[PDB]
């Protein structure tokens, strides 16, 4: 199939690393500009966590699309198009912890 | 040649002036003002965020 | 009799069966207790003696019909009856740090608690959550802590199976502890008895206290237990205030003020018919070191791990900074020395 | 003051020490990042960014992929600085 | 038929559109796959997805096709096809007072050449197609969210995207900000099964 | 007592000033904003009651949410509300701002501005007529007239 | 007794400003097929009191990014100077009789500008900074023309004493002698007070609220009062300068009434202009004031210098 | 777009103001802030149709 930006996973992994460097070097500015009440480590760990969620992906086309969406998210953060509400949406705080144990799920509700 | 006839360690780092005395222009480009002509603005019809 | 089966996913439109009457919900802790109750889908009943305007901020905390506002009178048991009649949980947060014209520490920390506890038994309320103060002593130097101890015994007499919570010094965005010290900059220096070297405080975050109350209701074993909500670190008064003036980027000028002079200053600020900036009991309570009660369960027993003050102090004191130090992060200021 | 290989090695090792995930027991000039220190690709990228901050030059990812050992980092820095 | 209830049919425009469709198909056989003229005199040309720029540039610049105005640019999600997304171009020819349609197809991954170089109006239309459906347009000057929220995840106009979405907003007093939470509805959207069990139009009967 | 009488009279004076000089902010989101303009039109003339449309939120007393409150718009509406100096009031105009209206089951619509800001008056309609919005504002003036803020302070 | 005179010149001016707000609202309404404030009090006469009580019972907010000292000093300077520019006005007798009251008025106006500047600068907002820069540009455009026109029209007065203006116009209004200067002075006064077709410092439809966008409750009320007091004072200056009034030394009330009526007419024309024209662009304002007025002001200054000499009509020095 | 049922399969709406607002930057080149206010008004933009 026709590629999007890369023809090999190695080429696709290169763009992921480039995005990570841009994201990693942006977190100190994001905390400073948005006046976040978190630490630089928390944001950088959060960036790592979101990258690690899409770690099982093997199709280079999907990898390119994820980086394309990754750059779009970074542009909003750099340009302060996002707000403190948008930035802190990754750090789910109002959401109560949902246990993943069967017995805990059994006690709560009919959730399969 | 050089900046001074008897250069020292501090002065040796300093290069001679340009041949036409035209110093290379600096790249300290002036940043604009990203005013937010946002939704609340009366001329923005209430639901227009104009990032100018 | 009023037993409800929880339904949903614990969200805003869910059903939790935690129909509650939060007395004094129009206050620092009240807001968070109501918000935690509201987000789970609980029928929160909010009695209020203030103007409905002051209760407006509680309205978005719950879904449609999940936040009912109805007036109550602390000196009228009948008004208490109609607000706890259909509640399976009653939480008492009514408490003023200053004696008023018509209400004295005895009337707010003894009479009202007893009335709430007594009436709740009559209506058949299952669980009651009373909020005392860690340093509640029957012979305490402060009348505030004095009445806080008398009322604690009366609640257990009126309501034998009632959970009693003794928070240390709750700190938060609308707090009168962290903001209290940060607001002393307007008076020049920072008057501290013995320069704050003879007082140890263990403040608690507002969110942790609120989640402890909610977990106490959810916990089936909290009935009759006496909890003590404290923070994870103990600070000297001087070290704590210096850290408060550190993240606030204010010039810290501490001068030792003798106890009699500080009490005299406190008396002067009691003249204000509005909310006093400080009180004689406020001075004594601040100078009084926090008690340690290892024989009582805390936040840890309820599953909530206490949040260190260092992590949640930037939120409170950011508004107290000038334009120069608004965007500074929360990591530049080093944590104060803890006496642990 | 001119730059020396020993100074570059010392600065690189100090930066590696500053990295939390790197255990000092296995930390050596010859120890591979992933094979010995137990690091990921993203950890290597963070290390490269830290080295860029320490020495004040830009490392393209082409070279960063090559860099896998502290001695390799020292060699790259020396070549870029002509030391 | 005739009489006031029926809509009159104009054969002249039908013949003209059919002739012009044959003309376009002859000129561009490399990309044109199918040509149709609907009974209400609307011409559709079906183009292989690689023919976006060539066919549109021809329809814009050709002396016998001056479709210099991009009326619309939309996508249709048919999840029953390999290429579910169907990109539709609506053109207007002020010189000949007629309109034409160009239809291509694309997957959830295969990109489409951006027609910004052909029509400058295609910019925001392609941005909206990307935002709503997920179709990526290569060589696009600025592709980003145009209609959804800034931190929105998912493409809503897809047929498999739920009507109410997955997340909802509200103001929390604890965090002093608007927070996104999983969607919970006080009343569920009552889905209605309205299709009649009897065939309505015999002229569109598909083979068994 | 004389104390209550003075406080009650002072409370009436304070309430009368606030309710008779309501200054809504120029904040309109959708179809309902057009009918809001017709309340300021000569036929109904909101300025006749002292209701004057100021622009900056800091110089306003009422926020009339007139239109759909989308998710992208919700943080902007809250911040603009928070920047209003107290006492501030919110009037929800139209079914879109009340409970989502026509777009209640939409992925990008907040189901009523009540989830973002506390609302004092709900004006029903799609769009509510210029009298209906005027009725709601006049109802808000009556609600302010029943505000015993000082009278409660004397009994605190 | 002098303190009583100070109070009798300040408090009535503040009441006049308060009721001028209502007058403006009602005039705009009736020129827009509307009715001004008509519910609060009979014919809306109690609206200003309600507005003042609301503003002074409204919570004032101190911006986090704002420099507090300047943010508070600006409103005070604006009102104090607005109340001070009435001290030398001859109605018919001035409270403070200066030989150079006119230059005092010019200096007081020049200082008042800094209120808008500091309020804008200290507000620490982009819109406020834009408003302050627009005020700077506005004062750049009108000040020279204002001073030149004032000098030219005072060349027939003989001195900068304001009281002498009554005598000079004892037989004829000075507008019959300098009506082009009268038109240009009227437009310059419109531009100076940040008023009709020149409301660029505030810019309701373009800058939300301009320099005072971050001001609320009391300080905003003080800026509004200062603005309207400057409006009335400048219209009074226009009245005394061109629309002279008869003064019977034994019945000063005659002048006072005539003066008041002329000032009221000029303020009503200010509102009339406010509800009749679109707003300028401050680039166009500066271009107008520098390329259509200033050349003409210079030409008329030459003319009014040469005229008394060429006609042997030089006014007396004393 | 009709699939033969009683509910439309797809209903794309072409807003006249959607294309006009896309060219706002093109039209507002070399103009001041006050001119953009004029340019927004002259395009006759209602954001209900723009943001379908
Ligand atoms: N750090 C702390 O604040 C600590 C507090 N506590 C205690 O725990 C509780 C926490 O409440 P807190 O957040 O401090 O509350 P606030 O001091 O912020 O507000 C007091 C609340 O109690 C109500 N109230 C007070 N007195 C009366 C009265 N006489 N009649 C009716 N209602 C009354 C108020 O209603 P209204 O506003 O209408 O008057 C309001 O809801 C209090 O009992 C407090 O003493 C214990 C340990 C630490
Ligand atoms: C403030 C917090 C901000 C958090 C936002 C962070 C983001 O934007 S995450 C978006 C980035 N997503 C990606 O890069 C997807 C990468 N896709 C992949 O397939 C990769 O995981 C690879 C190619 C398998 C490589 O990853 P691994 O090294 O195998 O693992
Ligand atoms: S309530 Fe109706 S008229 Fe008002 S904004 Fe919503 S859809 Fe438009």
């Amino acid at each position: 199939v026709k590629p999007i930006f890369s023809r090999d996973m190695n080429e696709a992994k290169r763009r992921v690393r480039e995005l990570y460097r841009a994201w990693y070097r942006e977190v100190p500015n994001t905390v400073h500009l948005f006046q976040l009440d978190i630490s630089v480590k928390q944001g950088r760990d959060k960036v790592r966590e979101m990258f690690m969620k899409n770690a099982h992906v093997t199709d280079p086309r999907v990898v390119d699309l994820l980086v394309i969406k990754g750059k779009m998210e970074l542009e909003e953060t750099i340009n302060v198009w996002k707000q403190r509400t948008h930035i802190m949406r990754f750090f789910h705080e109002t959401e109560a912890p949902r246990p993943t144990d069967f017995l805990s799920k059994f006690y709560v509700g009919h959730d399969p | 040649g050089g900046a001074v006839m008897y250069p020292t360690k501090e002065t040796a780092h300093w290069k001679p002036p340009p041949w036409n005395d035209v110093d290379p222009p600096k790249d300290t480009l002036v940043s604009n003002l990203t005013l937010n002509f946002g939704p609340q603005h009366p001329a923005a019809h209430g639901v227009l965020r104009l990032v100018m | 009799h009023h037993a409800l089966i929880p339904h949903g996913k614990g969200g805003r439109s869910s059903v939790s069966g935690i129909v509650a009457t939060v007395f004094g919900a129009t206050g620092f802790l009240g807001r968070y207790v109501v918000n935690h109750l509201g987000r789970m889908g609980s029928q929160v009943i909010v009695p209020y003696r203030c103007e409905p305007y002051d209760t407006m901020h509680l309205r978005p905390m719950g879904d449609l019909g999940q936040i009912i506002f109805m007036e109550w009178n602390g000196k009228d048991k009948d008004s208490i009856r109609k607000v706890v009649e259909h509640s399976n949980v009653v939480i008492n947060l009514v408490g003023r740090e200053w004696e008023t014209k018509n209400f004295d520490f005895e009337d707010v920390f003894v009479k009202i608690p007893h009335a709430i506890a007594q009436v709740s038994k009559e209506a058949g309320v299952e669980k009651l959550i009373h909020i005392s103060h860690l340093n509640a002593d029957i012979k305490s130097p402060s009348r505030y802590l004095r009445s806080k101890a008398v009322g604690e015994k009366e609640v257990r007499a009126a309501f034998p199976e009632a959970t009693i919570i003794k928070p240390s010094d709750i700190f938060g965005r609308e707090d009168r502890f962290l903001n209290y010290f940060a607001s002393m900059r307007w008076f020049g220096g920072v008057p501290l008895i013995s320069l704050g070297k003879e007082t140890v405080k263990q403040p608690v975050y507002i969110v942790d206290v609120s989640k402890g109350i909610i977990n106490a209701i959810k916990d089936p074993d909290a009935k009759g237990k006496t909890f003590a909500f404290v923070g994870p670190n103990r600070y000297l008064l001087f070290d704590l205030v210096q850290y408060i003036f550190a993240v606030a980027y204010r010039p810290f000028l501490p001068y030792p003020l003798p106890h009699f002079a500080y009490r005299w200053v406190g008396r002067l600020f009691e003249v204000s018919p509005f909310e006093p900036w400080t009180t004689r009991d406020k001075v004594e309570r601040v100078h009084m070191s926090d008690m340690t009660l290892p024989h009582l369960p805390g936040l840890e027993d309820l599953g909530i791990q206490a949040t260190p003050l260092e992590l949640k102090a930037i939120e409170v004191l950011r508004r107290h900074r000038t334009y120069r130090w608004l965007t500074s992060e929360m990591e530049d200021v080093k944590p104060a020395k803890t006496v642990n | 003051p001119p730059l020396t290989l020993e100074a570059i090695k010392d600065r690189v090792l100090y930066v590696l020490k500053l990295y939390d995930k790197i255990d000092p027991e296995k930390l050596s000039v010859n120890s591979h990042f992933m094979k010995d220190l137990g690091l990921d690709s993203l950890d290597q990228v963070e290390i490269i960014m830290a080295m860029e901050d320490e020495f004040g030059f830009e490392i393209p990812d082409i070279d960063a992929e090559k860099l896998m050992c502290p001695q390799e980092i020292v060699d790259y820095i020396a070549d870029k600085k002509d030391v | 038929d005739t009489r006031p209830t029926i809509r009159p049919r104009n054969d002249v425009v039908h013949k003209q559109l059919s002739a012009f469709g044959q003309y376009v198909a002859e000129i561009l056989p490399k990309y044109v796959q199918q040509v149709q003229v609907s009974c209400f005199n609307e011409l559709e040309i079906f183009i292989h997805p690689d023919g976006v720029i060539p066919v549109l540039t021809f329809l814009r610049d050709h002396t016998n096709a001056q479709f210099k105005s991009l009326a619309d640019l939309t996508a249709v999600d048919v999840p029953t096809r390999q290429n579910r997304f169907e990109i539709v171009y609506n053109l207007l020819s002020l010189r000949f007072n007629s309109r034409i349609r160009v239809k291509t197809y694309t997957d959830e991954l295969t990109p489409i050449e951006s027609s910004v170089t052909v029509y400058k109006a295609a910019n925001w239309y392609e941005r909206e197609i990307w935002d709503m459906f997920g179709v990526f347009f290569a060589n696009h000057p600025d592709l980003r969210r145009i209609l959804t929220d800034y931190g929105f995840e998912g493409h809503p106009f897809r047929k498999d995207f739920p009507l109410s979405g997955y997340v909802e907003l509200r103001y929390d007093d604890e965090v002093k900000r608007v927070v996104a939470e999983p969607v919970e509805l006080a009343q569920e959207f009552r889905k209605f099964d309205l299709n009649s069990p009897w065939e309505a139009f015999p002229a569109y009967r598909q083979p068994p | 007592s004389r104390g209550e009488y003075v406080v009650a009279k002072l409370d009436d004076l304070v309430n009368w000033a606030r309710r008779s000089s309501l200054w809504p902010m120029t904040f309109g989101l959708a179809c309902c904003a057009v009918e809001m303009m017709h309340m300021a039109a000569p036929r109904y003339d909101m300025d006749r009651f002292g209701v004057v449309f100021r622009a900056s939120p800091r110089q306003s007393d009422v926020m009339i949410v007139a239109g759909t409150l989308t998710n992208k718009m919700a943080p902007a509406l809250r911040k603009v509300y928070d920047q209003m100096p107290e006492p501030r009031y919110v009037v929800s105009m139209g079914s879109c701002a009340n409970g989502g209206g026509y777009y209640h089951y939409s992925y990008s619509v907040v189901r009523g501005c009540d989830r973002i800001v506390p609302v004092d008056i709900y004006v029903p309609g799609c769009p509510p007529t210029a009298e209906a919005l005027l009725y709601g504002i006049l109802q808000l003036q009556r609600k302010i007239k029943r505000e015993k803020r000082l009278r409660i302070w004397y009994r605190r | 007794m002098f303190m009583i005179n100070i109070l009798s010149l300040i408090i009535p001016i503040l009441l006049a400003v308060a009721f001028l707000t209502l007058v403006e609202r009602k005039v705009l309404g009736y020129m827009q097929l509307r009715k001004g404030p008509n519910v609060v009090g009979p014919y809306g006469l109690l609206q200003p009191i309600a507005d003042a009580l609301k503003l002074f019972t409204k919570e004032p907010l101190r911006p986090a990014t704002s420099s507090i000292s300047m943010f508070i000093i600006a409103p005070i300077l604006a009102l104090s100077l607005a109340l001070t520019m009435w001290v030398p006005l001859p109605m018919p007798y001035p409270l403070i009789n200066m030989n150079l009251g006119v230059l005092f008025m010019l200096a007081m106006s020049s200082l008042a500008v800094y209120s808008i500047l500091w309020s804008g600068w200290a507000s620490n907002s982009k819109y406020a900074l834009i408003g302050a820069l627009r005020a700077v540009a506005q004062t750049i455009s009108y000040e020279v023309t204002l001073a030149i026109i004032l000098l030219s029209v005072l060349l027939m007065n003989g001195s900068y004493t304001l009281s002498t203006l009554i005598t000079t116009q004892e037989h004829i209004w000075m507008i019959f002698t300098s009506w082009p200067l009268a038109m240009m002075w009227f437009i310059s006064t419109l531009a100076e007070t940040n008023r009709a077709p020149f409301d660029l410092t505030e810019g309701e439809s373009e800058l939300v609220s301009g320099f005072n966008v971050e001001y609320a409750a009391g300080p905003f009320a003080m800026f509004f009062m200062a603005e309207y007091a400057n409006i009335i004072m400048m219209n009074a200056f226009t009245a005394i300068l061109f629309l002279g009034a008869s003064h019977d030394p034994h019945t000063p009330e005659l002048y006072t009434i005539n003066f008041v009526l002329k000032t009221l007419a000029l303020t009503i024309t200010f509102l009339w202009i406010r509800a009749s024209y679109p707003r300028f662009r401050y680039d166009q304002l500066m271009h107008l004031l520098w390329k259509s007025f200033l050349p003409l002001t210079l030409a008329l200054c030459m003319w009014h210098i040469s005229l008394p000499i060429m006609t042997a009509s030089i006014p007396p020095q004393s | 777009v009709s699939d033969g049922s009683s509910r439309p399969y797809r209903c794309k709406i072409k807003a006249p103001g959607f294309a006009h607002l896309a060219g706002l930057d093109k039209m507002s080149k070399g103009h001041m802030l006050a001119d953009v206010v004029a340019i927004i008004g002259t395009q006759d933009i209602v954001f209900g149709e723009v943001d379908r």
Side-chain angles (χ1 to χ4, degrees), chain F residues 14 27 42-43 50-51 60 64 66 69 82 87 94 97-98 107-108 117 125 128 130:
Chain F
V14 172
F27 184 83
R43 173 165 298 188
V51 213
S60 62
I64 308 178
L69 181 51
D82 280 329
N98 287 5
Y107 55 88
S108 61
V117 295

Side-chain angles (χ1 to χ4, degrees), chain A residues 9 12-13 16 19 23 27 30 36 38 43 46-48 50-52 54-59 62-63 66-67 69-70 73-74 87 90-91, chain D residues 41-42:
Chain A
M9 269 290 293
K13 284 190 174 182
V16 179
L19 179 62
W23 263 112
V27 177
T30 301
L36 301 176
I38 65 177
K46 201 63 184 181
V47 170
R48 183 125 179 178
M50 302 302 295
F51 271 79
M52 286 300 182
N54 305 328
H56 64 284
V57 184
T58 63
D59 201 12
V62 185
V63 178
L66 289 169
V67 176
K69 296 186 179 181
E73 299 291 327
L74 181 67
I87 287 297
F90 301 95
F91 314 91
Chain D
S41 54
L42 298 186

Side-chain angles (χ1 to χ4, degrees), chain G residues 11 56 64 80 101 125 129 143 153 190 195 216 219 221 273-274 287:
Chain G
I11 294 182
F56 281 92
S80 58
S125 186
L129 184 66
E143 199 76 36
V153 302
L190 277 170
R195 211 37 176 78
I273 298 182
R274 190 245 173 90
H287 286 354

Side-chain angles (χ1 to χ4, degrees), chain C residues 11 14 31 35-36 39 174, chain E residues 170 172-174 176 184 186:
Chain C
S14 300
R31 308 169 58 120
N35 189 18
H36 279 290
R39 67 171 59 175
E174 30 276 343
Chain E
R170 70 169 186 84
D172 190 31
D173 185 67
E174 295 171 26
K176 254 68 181 179
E184 297 193 2

Side-chain angles (χ1 to χ4, degrees), chain F residues 30-32 67-68 94-96 102-103 125-127:
Chain F
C31 335
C32 288
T68 306
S95 60
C96 269
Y102 212 170
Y103 319 95
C126 181

Side-chain angles (χ1 to χ4, degrees), chain G residues 213-224:
Chain G
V213 66
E214 237 88 359
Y215 279 96
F220 171 76
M222 244 161 314
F223 273 122
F224 218 61

